Amino acid sequence: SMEQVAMELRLTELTRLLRSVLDQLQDKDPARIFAQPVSLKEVPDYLDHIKHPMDFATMRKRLEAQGYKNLHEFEEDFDLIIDNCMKYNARDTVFYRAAVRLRDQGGVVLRQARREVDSIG
Ligand code: NA
Structure with a gap:
């Protein structure tokens, strides 16, 4: 249908906006501390501490698969x-x-992305 296409056009524009947001958040981590998942070979106990690991590369793969349906899921x-x-x-x-x-410097980028997502739908 023509409906599914326009929804696909929107998701794709949202993906373009989140990509830019992601590149801006990652620029606030010049040490690349959060670039890659915490290594399980180097921190073998990690999953006993942290149940839902996250990092920028894992967010990037989800992004390019159009896995974020809205800004809230991305913020999570x-x-x-x-x-x-x-x-x-x-x-x-x-x-x-x-x-x-990263939290304090990311707040500014997230503050404006919320207005832009609302504003252009
Ligand atoms: Na602690």
Whole structure:
């Protein structure tokens, strides 16, 4: 149908907007601490601590498969990256501190993406 196509045109434009948002969030992590999944060979106990691992590359594969239906689902994954890190790592570590900085600097990008998604549908 012509309906399914226009919904596919919208999802595709949402995917284009989330791609740009994702590139902007990732620029706030120049150390690439959150780039890749936490290694299970190097942190074998990780899954005893953290039940839903997340990282930028895993968000990227979901993105290019048009796996995010809305901005909220995308925000949930970003929050997991941050919240996982702040639980596993203690306050006086480079990892925890990197999360806090990504959270505060990401807020601005997420604040405007919410207005743009509403605004253009
Ligand atoms: Na902790």
